[PDB]
Design a protein around this ligand. Structure first.
Ligand SMILES: CCCCCCCC/C=C\CCCCCCCC(=O)OC[C@@H](O)CO
Ligand SMILES: CCCCCCCC/C=C\CCCCCCCC(=O)OC[C@@H](O)CO
Ligand SMILES: C[C@H](O)CC[C@H](C)O
Ligand SMILES: C[C@H](O)CC[C@H](C)O
Ligand SMILES: C[C@H](O)CC[C@H](C)O
Ligand SMILES: C[C@H](O)CC[C@H](C)O
Ligand SMILES: C[C@H](O)CC[C@H](C)O
Ligand SMILES: C[C@H](O)CC[C@H](C)O
Ligand SMILES: [Zn+2]
Ligand SMILES: [Zn+2]
Ligand SMILES: [Zn+2]
Ligand SMILES: [Zn+2]
Lengths: 290, 290
């Protein structure tokens, strides 16, 4: 059929066109026509330079989140044809899990289903690694899957999670920078200290749209800051993973300081850059116990 | 006699007071009244004056509480009984002296010893030192959860005032930042000769630099203490780690980042930013990691 591309790219292009408009409105309508027209050219240069630094970090982080392909399980997590033949032909439910145990003994998996059964994906025909889940939209198993984000038309998992968090952060700073600088000129237009009708429209919407996204993404950003501190994905935050000693909402937690390092790494120079720096490989994760 | 030494302790406090009193006069009168309101910007004058007083009050309120909150001392239970105190003074063997202390310490909730595995005892105060408590030569007393003695507040920073001390810093950052950000545009205008008043030119110049100097100074102090609170270590413990029954532990009193902050700030969110006492416990016993 039309597949995701026909409609899945719609939220991306909507955000893209809003961001493109915000560039034209802030740079041309505001900085060139409004601020530079008011004979305060010093503020124009500072605003234009500062705006482009936030604009670049946002678009860079947004690009990385969209086009970073989600990681999938390695070869060891696919059932062998010998094991697949017996698994597909087996009728007894108890017998099926016994085949998995022989293959699972080689790989480092510390979690099971809510029924204490080895996590297995029927459509993908493989044994789900720890924290990995199958996405119907992505049609694949995603390592450390968080959720499918329509806004980036991609899965948010082990590969792009830090890019996703930076995409949020730089959206917060971008919207905040716009609202803070536009406010004084938004007020002047409607107290009739400034008159230009073409810029009046863009300056009003620059303030309202940036304030609408700031409030929207701030709660989302604060929520994920809590998730990273607890080392829980969005899926795990609802249905806690079941370990050998039972379900644990803190099974993958290593302490607040260590949990952030798992996502952002140990080198400070990569923390704020949308460059891959997460620890591990996405198939095995350190555990709270052993 | 001591009238020269006691008065000298108030010197750093009075210096801060005169800078703060001047900064009020400079910002409110010289800047808001004479410069901004004189510049026909009557909307900005009211907004700045209202915001300034909110930061000014929170700073002075936190600063007052840190100075005049008397430091807590050990309770009665940590003093040796008259029967035990008499024998302790008469005992000649060093090992025999520890036997009296060890027997009394078994009744008290003590989990730490000195670096020499000796029961912490204060000779001058004649009491058994509670955990994390230390004797201050300036205060001439044992201070519960002592952090350090501060010349800037002429008082010990310990279990009683530590949250007031942290809020005093926090509101110094916000006060200085608010001043520097709002004064900057008028600082620039004076020296591009868009404004002329020589009386206000002087105060606006120092308003920006003094607030920037203190901001840089207290920021490092604030970031350092934010680390201490996250690790549940006092300033003293950050140098000499406390020795527990299982040996010296730099994280002996740590309970995890979230709980360590709660120990200082409490469980009620409505008290976190107010210099009103809300710390957990009593300062004589503390939860342990093990
Ligand atoms: C000045 C303009 C700059 C704006 C750029 C900010 C970009 C923010 C991107 C996204 C914010 C969305 C706020 C979060 C809104 C989440 C609601 C949603 O999309 O539902 C999804 C689920 O129903 C799917 O099952
Ligand atoms: C424009 C308003 C001015 C706001 C004033 C903010 C008040 C900040 C209070 C103290 C800042 C000091 C930062 C510097 C702290 C120095 C470190 C110290 O330990 O000092 C003690 C030793 O020198 C022994 O005396
Ligand atoms: C010259 C102008 O007043 C400076 C603008 C700053 C960034 O606020
Ligand atoms: C633009 C951003 O502030 C760069 C930070 C890196 C870590 O240097
Ligand atoms: C500055 C003001 O006085 C603080 C309020 C407390 C309760 O006294
Ligand atoms: C005011 C302070 O930053 C918040 C403390 C809480 C417990 O994290
Ligand atoms: C000044 C500050 O907004 C007060 C917040 C407290 C927690 O109510
Ligand atoms: C949390 C602490 O108990 C608050 C005390 C004041 C009097 O309300
Ligand atoms: Zn799958
Ligand atoms: Zn997906
Ligand atoms: Zn003492
Ligand atoms: Zn002292």
């Amino acid at each position: 059929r039309c597949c995701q591309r026909v409609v899945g790219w719609v939220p991306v292009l909507f955000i893209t066109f809003v961001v493109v408009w915000s560039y034209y409105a802030y740079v041309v309508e505001l900085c060139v026509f409004t601020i530079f027209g008011n004979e305060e050219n010093g503020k124009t240069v500072v605003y234009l330079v500062a705006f482009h630094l936030f604009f670049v970090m946002f678009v860079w982080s947004y690009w990385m989140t969209i086009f970073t392909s989600p990681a999938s399980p390695s070869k060891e997590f696919y059932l062998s044809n010998s094991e697949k033949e017996r698994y597909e032909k087996e009728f007894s439910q108890e017998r099926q899990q016994e085949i998995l145990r022989r293959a699972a003994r080689a790989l480092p998996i510390y979690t099971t289903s809510a029924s204490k059964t080895i996590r297995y994906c029927e459509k993908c025909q493989l044994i789900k690694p720890d924290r990995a889940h199958h996405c119907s939209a992505c049609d694949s198993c995603i390592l450390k899957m968080d959720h499918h984000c329509p806004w980036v038309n991609n899965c948010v998992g082990f590969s792009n999670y830090k890019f996703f968090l930076l995409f949020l952060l730089y959206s917060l700073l971008y919207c905040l920078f716009v609202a803070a600088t536009v406010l004084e000129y938004f007020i002047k237009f409607w107290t009739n200290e400034l008159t230009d009708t073409r810029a009046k429209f863009h300056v009003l919407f620059l303030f309202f749209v940036s304030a609408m996204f700031f409030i929207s993404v701030l709660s989302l950003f604060s929520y994920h800051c809590w998730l990273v501190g607890k080392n829980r994905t969005t899926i795990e935050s609802f249905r806690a993973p079941t370990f050998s000693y039972g379900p644990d909402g803190n099974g993958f937690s290593l302490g607040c300081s260590k949990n952030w390092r798992q996502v952002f790494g140990d080198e400070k120079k990569y923390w704020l850059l949308p460059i891959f720096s997460s620890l591990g490989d996405g198939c095995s994760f350190p555990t709270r116990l052993v």
